[PDB]
A paper describes a structure:
Extensive optimization led to BI-2865, a derivative with a prolinol substituent and a pyrimidine linker, which enabled a direct ionic interaction with E62, as well as a water-mediated hydrogen bond network with the side chain of R68 and the main chain carbonyl of Q61. These showed a conserved binding pocket across variants defined by the α2 and α3 helices, the distal portion of the β1 sheet and the distal portion of the Switch II motif in KRAS. A part of the KRASi pocket overlapped with that occupied by covalent G12C inhibitors, such as sotorasib and adagrasib, with the notable difference that the pan-KRASi engaged the pocket without relying on a covalent tether and did not extend in the P-loop channel near the G12 residue. By comparison, the affinity was 60–140 times lower for KRAS variants loaded with the GTP analogue GCP. As a result, BI-2865 inhibited the proliferation of isogenic G12C, G12D or G12V mutant KRAS expressing BaF3 cells more potently than precursor 1 with a mean IC50 of roughly 140 nM.
The pan-KRAS inhibitor works by preferentially targeting the inactive state of KRAS to prevent its reactivation by nucleotide exchange.
Numbering used by the authors: 0 to 167
């Protein structure tokens, strides 16, 4: 049967979680997507010759630590932690997202990729070395992406699927 992988995209508002998701789903860059819409989207993709079913939860909205929201995020098997390379605050937020993922998954070993989005822009404020070094601290991959040009998009999502397989 076809394996389904539940992937969750997290990070500060405005980093491009929806744009990255919709590039994967629609193969189109969408510069405008209601910042409050949290939803999940499925797509069949071939990864290393295996057709699998991706179910991608594009997170949005208010930070809340109810049992319900914890259980919703707990369904994720792997997480993309996204910051924007021209937004230092979004990078400084990453450790909080990672903390919460470890908490709800009750594991120090959750499949996870650090994603530096908006790589097409010239306004870089987060050095690549600093982001690579944070991924090294966590023992996870770092992928540079642009939802606008498609740079890194498959690499980010497909790496997460490969991590989920290894973890199994
Ligand atoms: C960085 C923060 O800001 C925001 C703003 C919006 N969201 C968050 C946020 N943190 O984790 C999460 C997720 C969705 C991540 C996956 C696992 C779980 S489990 C659960 N219950 C979640 C929730 N809500 C989450 N989201 N944080 C700063 C710092 C603290 C105060 N705050 C102003
Ligand atoms: N140049 C550029 N803009 C992007 C990129 N990804 C998202 N954006 C823009 O960043 C803003 C927020 O994107 P959105 O997908 O709504 O972010 P979300 O709140 O994380 O879902 C919008 O103005 C998008 O057009 C990218 O890779 N490059
Ligand atoms: Mg969004």
């Amino acid at each position: 049967g076809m394996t389904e992988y539940k992937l969750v995209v997290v990070g500060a508002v405005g980093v491009g979680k929806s744009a990255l998701t919709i590039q994967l789903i629609q193969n189109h860059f969408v510069d405008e997507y209601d910042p409050t819409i949290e939803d999940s989207y499925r797509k069949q993709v071939v990864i290393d010759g295996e057709t699998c079913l991706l179910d991608i939860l594009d997170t949005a909205g208010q930070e809340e630590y109810s049992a319900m929201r914890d259980q919703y995020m707990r369904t994720g098997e792997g997480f993309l932690c996204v910051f924007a390379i021209n937004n230092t605050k979004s990078f400084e937020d990453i450790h909080h997202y990672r903390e919460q993922i470890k908490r709800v998954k009750d594991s120090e070993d959750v499949p996870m990729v650090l994603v530096g989005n908006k790589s097409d822009l010239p306004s870089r404020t987060v050095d690549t070395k600093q982001a690579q070094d944070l991924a090294r601290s966590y023992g996870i991959p770092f992928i540079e992406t642009s939802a606008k040009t498609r740079q890194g998009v498959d690499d980010a999502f497909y790496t997460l699927v490969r991590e989920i397989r290894k973890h199994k």
